[PDB]
Structure 1
Amino acid sequence: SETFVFSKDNLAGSSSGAITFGPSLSDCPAFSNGMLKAYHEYKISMVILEFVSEASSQNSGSIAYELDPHCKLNSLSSTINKFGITKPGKRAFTASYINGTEWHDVAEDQFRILYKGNGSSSIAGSFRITIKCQFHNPK
C-alpha cells in the first residue's frame, strides 16, 4: 500500500491541460517509468489534490478541475468544481469516485483530471497530487 507525492508547478492562469494517472504520467518520473514498468496490476485508491496559491492577489480567475474516470474527455466540459486562484484548496477523491475498485493493466490509464484556468498569464499556483495506490502480481 505505497504512496506517491508529486507536484505540477508553474500552472499558468489560462493553461488548460490534463493529468492522466497511469503510463502517461510523465510528470512523475518515479511512477510512469518506475513501479509501472515492473508490475502488472495497480489501482489508485485515493487521490488528494491540493491547490497551493502562489498567485498574487491581483490575479482574477479560477482553475476548474474535472475528474474523468475513463479518460474519455480531451478537454474540460463542466466548470463546477473550481479553486479560486487567490486561496488554497484541498480535495479528496476516494475509491468510488476515480474508478478505483478494480485492478488495471499498467498499459492502460485509470483516470484523468482535466484542469482549465481562465485567469491571466501570470503564475497562478501549484498542484500537489498525493496518490495512495497499491500494486499486485509482481513482475
Structure 2
Amino acid sequence: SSETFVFTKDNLVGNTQGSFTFGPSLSDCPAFKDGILKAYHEYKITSILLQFVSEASSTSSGSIAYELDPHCKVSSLQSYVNKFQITKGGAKTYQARMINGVEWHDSSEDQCRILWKGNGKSSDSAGSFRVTIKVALQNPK
C-alpha cells in the first residue's frame, strides 16, 4: 500500500530555520499526519526527495544549509557540510538506508528529521522546499 506525498513549505525569509520531523509530527502534511497514518498500525518512508525551489533575486547572498538526522535527536542544525544556494535552487534525494527506512516504524514514532538553517538577510525571500516522500504501510487499523 505504497503512496507518495508532495508537500511544500511557505514563503521563506532568507535566514529561515525549521525541521521536517517525518512521521506523526509533520505539521506541514496533514494528509500524512492524520490522514493515511491513522488507518495503519505501522509504516516506513521508502524515499525522501527534498527540493529547494528558489524565487530569489540574483543579488541576494546566502546559502541555506540542511542535515538529514536519521534518528530524531537534534533540534538545531549544528552541521554545515552540505547546503543549497539561495539564488540557484537545488535538490537532494535520500534513499531508504539513509533515512532509517529499512525497518517498520510504529504510527506514533517519528522516523527522521531533516533540518535547515539559512544565513541570508532577514528581508529577502527564497520560498521553497517542495518535498516528495514515498511511504509504505502494511498493517491496517
- The bucket for the TM-score relative to the shorter chain is over 0.9
Residue 56 of structure 1 aligns to which amino acid in structure 2? S
Q: Is the 8 A contact 2:49 2:132 kept in 1?
A: yes
**How far apart, in 2, do the equivalents of 1:11 and 1:106 lie?**
30
Residue aligned with 2:18, SS: strand
What's the counterpart of residue 139 of structure 2? Answer: 137
- Given that 2:9 and 2:127 are in contact with CA atoms closer than 8 Å, whether structure 1 keeps it comes out as no
Q: Is the 8 A contact 2:53 2:128 kept in 1?
A: yes
Q: Provide the rounded CA distance (Å) in 2 between the counterparts of 1:2 and 1:31.
A: 10
In structure 1, the gaps of 5 or more residues are none
Whichever residue aligns with residue 137 of structure 1, its letter is: N
Aligned to 1:137, what secondary structure does the other structure show?
A: coil
CA distance in 1, matches of 2:29, 2:130: 11
Once residues 132 and 114 of structure 2 are traced to their aligned partners in structure 1, the CA distance between those partners, rounded to angstroms, is: 13
- Please give the secondary structure, in 1, of the residue aligned with 2:73: coil
Deviating 4+ runs (over 2 angstroms):
none
Tell me by how many angstroms 1:127 deviates: 0.4
Give the Cα–Cα distance (whole angstroms) in 2 for the partners of residues 129 and 20 of structure 1: 12
Q: Which residue does the alignment assign to 1:22?
A: 23
Provide the identity percentage.
Answer: 68
The 3-state SS of whatever aligns with 1:30 is helix
- Deviations along 1:95-116, one digit per CA (max 9) or x if unpaired, are 0110100000110100010010
Which secondary structure state, in structure 2, belongs to the residue aligned with residue 37 of structure 1? Answer: helix
Displacement, 1:125? 2.8
SS of match in other structure, 1:126: coil
CA offsets 1:49-89 (integer angstroms, 9 cap, x no match): 11001111121100001000111100001101100010121
Structure with higher strand content: 1
Instruction: Count how many residue pairs are aligned between Structure 1 and Structure 2.
Output: 139
Q: Does the Cα contact within 8 Å between 1:85 and 1:125 map onto a contact in 2?
A: no
The letter of the residue matching 2:130 is R
* Superposition RMSD in Å: 0.8
Q: Note the residue ranges of structure 2 that are not aligned, 5 or more in a row.
A: none
The 2-side partners of 1:77 and 1:24 are apart by: 21
Q: Which residue of 1 is the match for residue 92 of structure 2?
A: 91
TM-score, normalised via structure 2 length? 0.95
Q: In the alignment, which residue of structure 2 is the partner of 1:124?
A: 126
